[PDB]
Amino acid sequence: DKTVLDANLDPLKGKTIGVIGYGNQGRVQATIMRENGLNVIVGNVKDKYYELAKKEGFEVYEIDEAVRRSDVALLLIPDEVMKEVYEKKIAPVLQGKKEFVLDFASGYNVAFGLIRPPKSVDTIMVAPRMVGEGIMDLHKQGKGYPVLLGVKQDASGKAWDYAKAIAKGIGAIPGGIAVISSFEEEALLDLMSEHTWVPILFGAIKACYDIAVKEYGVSPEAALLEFYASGELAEIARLIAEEGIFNQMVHHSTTSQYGTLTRMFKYYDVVRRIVENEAKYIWDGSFAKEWSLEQQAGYPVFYRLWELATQSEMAKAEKELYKLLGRK
Amino acid sequence: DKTVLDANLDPLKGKTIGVIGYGNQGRVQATIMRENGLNVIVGNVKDKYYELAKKEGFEVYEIDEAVRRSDVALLLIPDEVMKEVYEKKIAPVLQGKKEFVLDFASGYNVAFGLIRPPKSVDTIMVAPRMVGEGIMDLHKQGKGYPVLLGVKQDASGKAWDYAKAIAKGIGAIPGGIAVISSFEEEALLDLMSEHTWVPILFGAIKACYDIAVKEYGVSPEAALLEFYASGELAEIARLIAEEGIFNQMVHHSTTSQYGTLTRMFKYYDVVRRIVENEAKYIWDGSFAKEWSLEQQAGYPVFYRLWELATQSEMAKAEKELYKLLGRK
Amino acid sequence: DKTVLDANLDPLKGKTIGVIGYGNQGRVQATIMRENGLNVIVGNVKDKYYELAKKEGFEVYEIDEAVRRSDVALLLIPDEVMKEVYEKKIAPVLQGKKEFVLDFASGYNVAFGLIRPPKSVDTIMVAPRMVGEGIMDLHKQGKGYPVLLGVKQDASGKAWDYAKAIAKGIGAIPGGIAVISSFEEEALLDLMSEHTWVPILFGAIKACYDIAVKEYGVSPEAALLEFYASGELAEIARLIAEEGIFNQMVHHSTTSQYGTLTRMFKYYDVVRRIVENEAKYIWDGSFAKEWSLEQQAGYPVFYRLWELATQSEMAKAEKELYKLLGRK
Amino acid sequence: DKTVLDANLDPLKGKTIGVIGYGNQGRVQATIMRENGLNVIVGNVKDKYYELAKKEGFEVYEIDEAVRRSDVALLLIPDEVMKEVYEKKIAPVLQGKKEFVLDFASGYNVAFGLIRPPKSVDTIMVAPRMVGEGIMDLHKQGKGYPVLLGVKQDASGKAWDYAKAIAKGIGAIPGGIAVISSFEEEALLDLMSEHTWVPILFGAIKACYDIAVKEYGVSPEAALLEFYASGELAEIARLIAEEGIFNQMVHHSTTSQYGTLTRMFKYYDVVRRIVENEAKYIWDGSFAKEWSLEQQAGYPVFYRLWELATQSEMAKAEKELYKLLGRK
Ligand SMILES: [Mg+2]
Ligand SMILES: [Mg+2]
Ligand SMILES: [Mg+2]
Ligand SMILES: [Mg+2]
Ligand SMILES: [Mg+2]
Ligand SMILES: [Mg+2]
Ligand SMILES: [Mg+2]
Ligand SMILES: [Mg+2]
Known about the structure:
The structure is cut from a larger assembly and holds four copies of chain A (328 residues). With 328 residues, chain A is of the alpha/beta class. The first copy, chain A, has two domains: 1-181, Rossmann fold, CATH 3.40.50; 182-328, no CATH class. Helices cover 53% and strands 12% of the residues of chain A. Chain A contains 16 helices and nine strands. The first copy, chain A, has helices at 24-35, 48-55, 63-69, 82-95, 108-111, 133-139, 159-169, 184-193, 197-215, 220-227, 232-243, 254-266, 268-283, 286-297, 300-310, 313-322, and strands at 3-4, 17-20, 40-43, 60-61, 72-75, 100-104, 121-128, 147-153, 178-180. In chain A, strand 8 (147-153), helix 7 (159-169) and strand 9 (178-180) form a beta-alpha-beta unit. In chain A, helix 8 (184-193) packs across helix 13 and helix 9 packs antiparallel against helix 10 (220-227). Bound molecules: magnesium ion (MG) (8 copies). One magnesium ion binds at residues 190, 193 of chain D. Chains A, B, C, D: It comes from Saccharolobus solfataricus (Sulfolobus solfataricus). Chains A, B, C, D: This is Ketol-acid reductoisomerase. Chains A, B, C, D: One of its GO terms (biological process) is isoleucine biosynthetic process. Chains A, B, C, D: Belongs to the ketol-acid reductoisomerase family.
């Protein structure tokens, strides 16, 4: 019901479009939406990406200049620097506009109020769910891919139309799909993954290694081979994305199935509590405060943790081992 | 003992006075103290208030220029911007002075050390306990009103005299009274109210609504009417300010008296613990740190909480209802 | 919605109506419904009110005599004496009736079974949500006001019609509204207010005073001025009833908003537990037992608590102060 | 300080005095104050005491009649029946008085509001601290005894004088002393003894017996002889009232002193908690409610406890023993 499969592409025809940043995402979106017959430009500072974009056939300007010539803009840059760029270069140029559009690929800076555009602007979001390299690898096959849509400020009653038009312009549909959501329901999701199961998985692996080594006389080389130094995990991820998460286990032994199911239903509430706590810590905006303040301080905890992680015994053992199998 | 009812007004005669800001407070204080025969000026940036003040018959200058011409100054601006104003415009002009006076209406920025004037300056405080509109509504009747006094730095042995003179000049006494206190005993009080019983009251009301609706099948319209959508509370506030807090209940039914008294003496320690915790959190200066850091981050929690509060079910129901009774 | 805005007034025309008690409500409800052209009488014992009632143009009889002449009755007396009056004077006269109506303004004595009329009677409830003095202060403007409706026993299939007719007859609609509810959903609400947030507020204020005085060396006069001796609370109640509870804070400083919101969302569960406990204690009928038993004992706890509250330090300080400001 | 040793006796001369009840107290107070030259009468119902009083030379009337003839009255009857007597016979006769006095020997019924005389009456209290026989046994020697004084309602500015006059009239001073206090400070004291150390002592004795018998094979006769069947406790009480509580132990062995002191300082907080709880339960009026409600039910708990206590194993054994030593 809340799903979309295709839509029109007329509202973007005759209008000019400007892309900010020429990294992976921006490069991909621009290279694609140029094929569908759209006047496109690029805004960026004079660096490597500037030369690359000018080589690939794109007329380039400065950001403030690119926004002047454009009726629509894509702010495809990291969430850690977008704030200053918007405050210094964009907002001034933008106060003197009449009817404009502003698209994002992440709702972090907007959902939490770090960027508050005027009311004369249509604020939208188009969030892909892919790495960026495989995207192009799928467009050559004529395939699409999934995205999320959202609207924060509607001043023309045409926002959703613009969002679906953009979605079509970048090769996401038809072939893939597009879901309608909010700026909050995207940041919340992107952050819950980085906070709940990735670190839990890593800590579980590390603890298994430490226990096996310091309580049962196991050697490091075998622990690493069993846990992650082999490619058993990539196979599982593949079978999951292809056949399903539970149907994947049918290709394993009965003993593994029994143990996995029992221990999954046994430890479900514990992780549920953690997920509740973290989702609550996010929904309120505390994590954004924490991260911004650590930025303003000089990334000391970042530094110390990056150190403690690399100087761990497991990391040294993995270094010695990878050197033995030819892996750089 | 610690109370005052009237005092002299001579030390301010012959001296020039400058008022910073022409908002709610400054406007009133200036308009009044001009009637009592005092050379008064105004300092502010060119905006609406500047036009209003130059209209009402006040000679205006730039802030830095007003302090040069003045021997006394009233810093009547919000506590959230006073710091930069003082650091940039006032302090430079102030190092090259001989004998000066500086008055505040709040001790937040001084009690916690965010503003540390020199030792060649007399630092005082005169804090009213009124809204600002009712003040003028009382001066026309020849009435006064209550204020708090305080001194942080005395370089002339005359501070208290200056403070009482100011109090008299703004029509607080005679007719009202004036209490002597500290910059700390004013911020502490102004904050304990905003941290202990206001939020507790609001949360209790919200919880009553939620419980009544989701556990006893009550309709929202009736809950809102009983709790706050009727002016029952304003009557209680009036009778409290007029006759007293306990003597107010004599006009209620015996059942209400019994229940209220029992449940008040039953839940006294719980709230006492909360009040202790918050007063301790304030006395040390942690809240100032918290608030300043949230300012430096971009008000993310402010934003998210303002959202969560308005998007609550009770707020939507109140919106639907107020629309039905004609209340805009 | 269940809401009602206007209805007919025919079923009461030709019938006679009798009002019991001539206090605030009775004096109010009777005059209005007389203005709308209804044969009305009054029942009361020979006392002060009797003289006033016979003065204002109402033909008076004894209570038992008023019900003989009446086809409808309004039992507008305190809930603490209604029981004996009903048991001695009304019920006997009422066993020998054919088709009757009985209206209440409170569902306390009926919701809990302290009054169980026969099955040959229509039992209803019309509960206003106003003080009683301001009611006429709105009827003079041609305005209405809100009420709650309920039915306990229907013997004519016309109960709701009679209830809406009454609502119209007393000037509640049109201009106000009328909600349909039960005798339980009215007593529960009237009691939850007197048990949850009023006493909590009072205890919080008292605790703030005690702490500030006995742990930070503050003077009583300043504490009283900050907390409630000033009319800050009345303005809050006004803006709440007018603009809304949350939209009210927009007129306060950002610091106050931040602190209030944080501490409200921080202490929400604590008060929720209390509200749950009290609502449960009420829904079962325990409080009715408690209150009916304290009467038979002689109101000892009532007495001792009324004493302890007035002999408190805060009360003595407030007495000394109010005497200093002219407040009687 | 708060002590008194003697005072005048004039205000009671020329006035008539009436005594209610001729039991232990009344028979004494009246008998004495007749010797000091005071017109005295008695009010009581026709029984045993009425015959005794008319025999001893006192003119007797009915209660209601005695108050008509008296300007002062002593309500010396049990606290369990005074309420009805006052409500039926006294209060009516008392509304039509001009200047009257009412004296009590206990503040239970007044401190808790079970008796609320008018404002045209002086309400006082004179509480002895003796059994009633020893009072005469000392008066025969020209000695006094101690009492407590209190005033609840003063309408002539002469109450304290009347109280001291009464004290002198009954032979309490000179020879003894008189303390000034309140009705509350007398009820609280009279009740704390009956709730804290008497029952604790009894329970400790019972537990010692039970333990010694059911865990160490001791015989009942020896346990009873050691604990209380011997009059050692009476000698302890005597030496306490005479020499002091601690100085009493000097006549015991060092081992006893050491053990007693150690275990007293070891178990002090435990009993302190109990005393706090009970004093709080009293100060609020809960015990009055409890006791007034057990009467209306029919004294069931009283009955069952009186049974359980007498049918205990300790009470039976005591029976055989007391029968063996000649003690009836
Ligand atoms: Mg991410
Ligand atoms: Mg992700
Ligand atoms: Mg404030
Ligand atoms: Mg305040
Ligand atoms: Mg009520
Ligand atoms: Mg209410
Ligand atoms: Mg006793
Ligand atoms: Mg005793």
